[PDB]
RNA sequence: GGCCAGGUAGCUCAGUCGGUAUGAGCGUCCGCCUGAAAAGCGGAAGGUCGGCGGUUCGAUCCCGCCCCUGG
């Protein structure tokens, strides 16, 4: 995760040691973090709580017996000679805990205000408060235990609790890991203010703990990419000791539940300055600490009590028995610190951030550690993280710092922790914003965010500092400067662009074909690209169908859709069942959109080094790696296809429906198609066409198959087309009509052909034998009385004769006609109407 | 009397967007380039600067083709249409694309799982911050008409540097967020064979669902995708 | 900036007519020969106030045209005397219209920009010129086939290429009876935008089509393109998931009624509740009262937080009745 | 069989042209203006020189 | 990931810890009624109670695994 929490009033205390009395409102600290760049998702103000809203003692406590769950009976100590008598539901507490009671007269959040009544036979004079009452926290199962020695009976509540403070909720971006901490943000404040800023990780704030000799035996194995690990003890602690309310608060307010002095030590550092800690248990190690890669099979109980499956990329901390931890993910409960620890050894360490990233999202660990340590963390301050832990836990705990400190820092060690320099023109940030900054802008703000600046005539030499590992290159600076400045200066300039060539011809196909079906009565709806689960089986496709050949998902969103959708039909009926399902039953949707259909299992290209362009080779391997992804135009129609209306009754949908839809795609990419009986699931095969450009097979049409309708729960009739757009050709004609002014010949001729012929075929006869004089040719009847043999039809065609110089004879015409009565003879077998 | 014989028809409002979105584009000299859903993972991911086993690669989920470790996904936005433009186009370029994007987030009424993205692609020389902003003014304009206000505050992206996000104002009237945008990386541009020190570019892409969503006031995104004609109808035949 | 909205309207107005059935031609701007004499209009008819040319190429056509259709029932009249008898032609061009005698305004200096009140001063010199739309049919409006012999051209798909334009523009129309020549008198709409008169539309008069030699039963549509405002709606529509309830309603109104008045009687009064509303029947008789009618209208009622009971319909039904006979003086059949 | 119930339709060829051509200015940031047929001879002779 | 809690007719839901879900409202069908409808009155149909197995003479109900949602 990427979420940083913290209070209002510890974020303006670290800034306001640099920056004495600096304070801003809520909505203007929202606003300049917003303005630099770090999203604020929440700012959440506690309380607030009005009236007599104390801090009391619990001393004494009668069990109210007989209940549906344990009641008691309190006497609560709120500073003054009265001892009030509350009664409470919770458990969690006895006769001397510091607790916060709201007396009858306060308002707690929410609106409540609190009043004496007559509960469980007995008087409440008022409630003792938990923190999601108090709008502290968001704990309700008991309710809020002060610490010992968190305030008096009697002390104002609000001020105890703090509750005029505000949290931010922030969400941090990946490349700005020194930002998960009050150190970071601080610095970030600073800099957007203008401000003089002190690191609460200086030697100045954290003052170096003596170096007197090794704190414990430790071997690191370098090629575990351990860039820091530091120990140093701390004995004698307090086992009875708790830590300040101070320090339980503000952990509370980060999203940290406090436990011990010796954790919450290293929590509230952790918080503060960015680098993990962690504390182990020194009684429980068993000789030398080693960090090396786990081995195969290797397993690790980790501190929460679950043993976890390691792997040889994972990095350990073991000694002679055991697995201390999970290198910068969690601790294990061999060395995790107890009720009874008396000996702590704290340890630092910077650990590979590649080598965190991977174990912890194996191991589905994103704890606390591993997402700072997967962003990086500041190599710098690991000493003075530690030795600001040990002297926050002697002081807290009783114990005594020791003087003894190991610290491996590589090999050989490293001494300066600083990224390369960068060499940057002084004036890029003004030519990638478009601005002209003030002389020194870019200078001055790289030394703000803590980079060294070295003039060398107009080229600048710029040395990050060790928490900045995101700034690499001249554009990484670039962003600084621009954030910094405010990208609300940058002006609105329109770019030089050059003349285009507008759309493709199939962008504008699409186009055309969206507009024409729409406006033939057809909605059009987005296909979902994931297939319906055991949708060709519905279908009942044989097994090596081409369309079952599709590409799996490995994490869909629903299990049992993983495949890519080979066709459109299957989204589109779905958008069907749910149109009819909910009253709408006479619909016609249309989809234009790609399929994916892989010629092959699924091959993968291996990593091509990303500093070059990759060669014409390797761009025409990644290529056919890939499934071809054609373009689709489909459609699917249910139900009345005319509407009824005062004309009449409306007219069912037909298939002849869906080969009209095909006629006016055709229409509208302005190329001839042709239709012939076909049989292709799911369709009907006594009404199923295929649609051939040519000689080429673009797409089928017509009624659904009856048994695929009821396996699929569709309307009855249910009728659909799909073609594949691609496997049309792009057509651009060129008409050059010449109008004939000589009148035409009107003529029909009526055809007996048998039943399985069809009509364009007859059609298509009758004009190669009828010659350049045809002008027009449609068929107005067809007839199948018994007059007319069995399995056979009459058709009639109405016929326009015209000659471009000439005024025709009707002997000239049926010249014409003859001669396509004869080639309708040869060709589809007609006999001329007796 | 009705005379209407015809069912009434519709084109898909978020079809009718990136048509006006394109044509706004092409007014202005930009082309419409393609590309494909599925995306191997050099072009989705390690041509746009993501770094490996990092965070900005892994906090963002993908849908991963089978087998595993396939380098084989869906497309988690159409960003890696700019490495196929730089790579098979001649300099300058001026682009935008439309399509399909592919997100692990659950369908509510503001979330959608596949949603449509509209990618812009400037590379030329001497292009600043300045023209991204004049660039996403111009495109705000179109959608939200004349009083469209703009706001850019920093953000990170893994292709970008600087990176930044758009926000709008056209509540009843606050800033909300629009889409990103930045500088394109000169490591994306190294990864395709332009020099940095010649050619700079910005990029940026806005959902068209979230666009929408707020130019309408429309309440459930999921009536946008579901494909319910009551959805569909209102907004007429388009065109 | 790309295309204006008018410019946009006016391809889509032309791409939803050409896939209608209508055939684009380019209108002439020369009046035929005394084309409004064969209309029979009026001595005082604004469209008699023409401009007229010094020098036509014909002595007996030189004034401009005030509308598109004599443009257009001549090429009509070219088809049908060709063979081409059924046949449906529309065109959007401008048309010009002057509100004067032909004022002309003194030469402006050339060595200097006019000002704006020059500029002002020679536009009111010039006709105003508005973008019509116009359409005209004849014949088979629907062509014979195999489904059955096809529907002569009638007055009601004049009207379906008004509601074509008006889907076009993306606005409501609503049709009013009314007489203007050369239309039927009893065949003919007005067009209405709101409240603005935008054109007409229906069958053309019987005496017109025998004078001009047109067909019989010659329809047309003319509509002013400025006169119908752009709109570019935004609507944000919300599907309720709950059932709808189904219903349908008789009313008996005077023959004169227009059945959309009717309708829009129902819907006021029926509510938000009402999802859909169709008339699916016309019906006369002696059931009825003489001189008038009975309407059958298809009611979708649907909440968008609840499943209706049938008495939640029925009372959003009765309120429609009450609407109805309120607005139309509807009665209930019985 | 036949299935277009609905007559054959065109727009104009010279319509389309024109169309083809705006289209081919706007793609390069032109625009598209607007001009009355009968105009002022300020503006068809006068104006122009 | 956690133990819960949801998945039930065409839609939105209620309800059952072993042999009928006498399921509701709306949706579908039939009769009376109407020229044809609707309402009204009177009636019907339709769920394999998320999937796959196990227990049992029998599973919506009990057990296991799994898929899809909210905390
Ligand atoms: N989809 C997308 N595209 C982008 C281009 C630049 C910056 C951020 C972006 N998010
Ligand atoms: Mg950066
Ligand atoms: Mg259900
Ligand atoms: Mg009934
Ligand atoms: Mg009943
Ligand atoms: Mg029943």
Redesign the interface.
């Known amino acids: 995760s990427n979420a940083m929490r913290l209070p209002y009033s510890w974020l303006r205390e670290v800034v306001a040691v640099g920056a004495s009395g600096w304070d801003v409102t809520p909505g203007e600290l929202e606003q300049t973090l917003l303005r630099i760049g770090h999203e604020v998702e929440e700012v959440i103000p506690l309380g607030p709580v009005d009236g007599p809203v104390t801090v009391g003692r619990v001393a004494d406590i009668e069990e109210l017996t007989g209940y549906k769950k344990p009641i008691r009976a309190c006497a609560v100590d709120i500073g003054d000679r009265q001892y009030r008598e509350i009664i409470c539901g919770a458990t969690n507490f006895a006769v001397g805990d510091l607790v916060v009671v709201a007396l009858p007269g306060a308002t707690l959040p929410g609106g409540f205000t609190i009043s004496a009544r007559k509960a469980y036979g007995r008087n409440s004079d008022g409630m003792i408060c938990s923190a999601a009452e108090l709008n502290l926290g968001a704990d309700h199962s008991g309710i809020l235990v002060l610490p010992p020695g968190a305030a008096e009976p009697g002390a104002d509540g609000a001020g105890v609790l703090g509750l005029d403070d505000v949290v931010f909720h922030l969400a941090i971006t990946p490349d700005r890991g020194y930002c998960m901490s009050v150190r970071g943000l601080a610095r970030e404040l600073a800099c957007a203010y203008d401000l003089d800023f002190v690191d609460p990780a200086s030697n100045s704030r954290v003052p170096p703990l003596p170096i007197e000799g090794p704190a414990w035996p430790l071997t690191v194995q370098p090629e575990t990419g351990v860039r820091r690990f530091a120990l140093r003890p701390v004995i004698g602690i307090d086992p009875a000791a708790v830590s300040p309310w101070w320090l339980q608060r503000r952990l509370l307010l980060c999203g940290i539940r406090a436990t011990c002095p010796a954790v919450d030590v290293t929590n509230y550092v952790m918080l503060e300055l960015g680098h993990p800690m962690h504390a182990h248990d020194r009684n429980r190690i068993s000789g030398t600490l080693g960090v090396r890669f786990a081995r195969s099979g290797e397993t690790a109980v980790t501190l929460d009590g679950i043993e976890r499956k390691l792997d040889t990329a994972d990095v350990l901390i073991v000694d002679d028995a055991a697995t201390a931890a999970i290198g910068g993910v969690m601790g294990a409960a061999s060395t995790e610190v107890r009720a009874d620890s008396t000996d702590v050894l704290l340890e630092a360490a910077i650990w590979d951030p590649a080598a965190v990233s991977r174990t912890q999202r194996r191991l589905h660990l994103p704890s606390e550690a591993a997402r700072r340590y997967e962003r990086t963390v500041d190599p710098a301050i690991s000493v003075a993280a530690l030795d600001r832990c040990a002297r926050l836990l002697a002081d807290i705990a009783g114990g005594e710092v020791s003087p003894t400190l190991t610290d491996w820092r590589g090999d050989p060690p490293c001494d300066d922790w600083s990224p390369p320099p960068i060499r940057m023109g002084v004036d890029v940030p003004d030519r990638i914003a478009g601005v002209a900054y003030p002389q020194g802008t870019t200078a001055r703000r790289l030394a703000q965010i803590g980079a060294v600046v070295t003039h060398d005539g107009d080229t600048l030499t710029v040395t990050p500092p060790s928490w900045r590992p995101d700034l690499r290159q001249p554009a990484d600076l670039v962003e600084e400067v621009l954030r910094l400045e405010g990208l609300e200066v940058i002006p609105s300039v329109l770019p030089p662009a050059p003349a285009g060539r507008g759309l493709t011809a199939g962008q504008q196909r699409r186009r055309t074909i969206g507009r024409s079906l729409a406006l033939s009565g057809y909605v059009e709806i987005l296909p979902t690209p994931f297939l319906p689960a055991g949708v060709f089986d519905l279908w009942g496709l044989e097994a090596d169908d081409s369309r079952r050949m599709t590409t799996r998902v490995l994490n869909p969103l629903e299990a049992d859709r993983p495949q890519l959708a080979t066709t459109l039909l299957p989204a589109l009926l779905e958008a069907l069942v749910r149109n009819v399902s909910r009253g709408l039953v006479d619909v016609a949707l249309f989809a234009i959109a790609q399929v994916v259909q892989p010629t092959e299992q699924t091959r993968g290209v291996g990593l091509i080094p990303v500093d070059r362009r990759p060669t014409d080779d390797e761009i025409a391997m990644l290529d056919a790696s890939l499934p071809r992804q054609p373009q689709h135009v489909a459609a699917v129609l249910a139900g009345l296809r005319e509407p009824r209306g005062p004309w009449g009754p409306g007219r069912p949908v037909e298939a002849a429906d869906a080969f009209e839809a095909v006629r006016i795609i055709a229409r509208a990419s302005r190329v001839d198609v042709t239709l012939r009986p076909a049989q292709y699931l799911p369709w009907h095969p006594g009404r199923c066409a295929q649609v051939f450009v040519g000689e080429s097979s673009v797409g089928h049409a017509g009624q659904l198959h009856p048994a695929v309708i009821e396996r699929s729960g569709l309307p009855k009739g249910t009728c659909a087309v799909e073609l594949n757009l691609d496997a049309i050709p792009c057509s651009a004609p060129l008409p050059a009509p010449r109008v004939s002014p000589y009148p035409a010949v009107f003529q029909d001729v009526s055809l007996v052909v048998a039943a399985d012929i069809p009509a364009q075929a007859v059609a298509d006869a009758v004009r190669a034998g009828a010659g350049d004089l045809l002008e027009d040719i449609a068929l107005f009847d067809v007839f199948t009385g018994p007059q007319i043999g069995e399995h056979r039809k009459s058709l009639t065609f109405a016929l326009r004769f015209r000659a471009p110089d000439r005024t025709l004879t009707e002997d000239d015409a049926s010249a014409a006609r003859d001669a396509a009565v004869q080639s309708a003879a040869e060709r589809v077998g007609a006999v001329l109407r007796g | ?12 409002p ?2 009718m967007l990136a ?1 006006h979105v ?3 584009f ?7 380039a393609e590309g ?8 989705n991911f ?2 746009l ?1 993501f770094p ?5 690669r ?2 963002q ?1 993908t ?10 996904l ?1 497309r988690t936005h159409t960003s890696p249409v700019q490495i196929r433009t730089l ?1 098979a186009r001649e300099l ?1 370029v ?1 682009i935008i694309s439309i399509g ?1 994007t ?1 997100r ?1 987030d ?1 369908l509510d009424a503001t979330h959608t ?2 949603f ?1 993205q509209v990618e812009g692609l ?1 590379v ?1 020389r ?6 991204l ?3 996403l ?2 495109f705000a304009r179109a959608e939200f008409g004349p009083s469209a206000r703009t ?6 992206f893994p292709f970008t ?4 996000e758009v926000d709008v104002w056209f509540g009843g009237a606050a800033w909300v967020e629009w889409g990103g945008c930045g ?1 394109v ?3 994306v541009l ?4 332009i020099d940095p020190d010649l050619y ?1 570019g910005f990029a940026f892409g806005m959902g068209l669902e979230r666009t929408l969503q707020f ?6 995104m999921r ?17």
Not at chain 2, 126 to 131: D, E, F, K, V
Not at chain 2, 223 to 239: C, H, I, Q, T, Y
């Open positions: 009397l009705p005379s209407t014989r015809v069912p009434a028809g519709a084109r898909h978020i079809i048509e394109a044509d706004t092409i007014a202005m000299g930009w082309e419409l494909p859903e599925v995306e191997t993972e050099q072009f390690d041509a600067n490996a086993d990092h965070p900005a892994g906090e989920d849908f991963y083709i089978a087998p595993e470790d396939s380098r084989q869906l790579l300058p001026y399909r592919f692990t659950e799982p596949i449509h400037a030329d001497g292009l600043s911050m300045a023209h902003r004049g660039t003014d111009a706001r850019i505050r920093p953000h990170f540097e600087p990176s930044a500088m990386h000169p490591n190294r990864a395709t064979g700079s130019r309408n006031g429309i309440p459930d009536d946008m995708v579901e494909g319910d004609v009551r959805f569909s109808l209102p907004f007429g035949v388009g065109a």
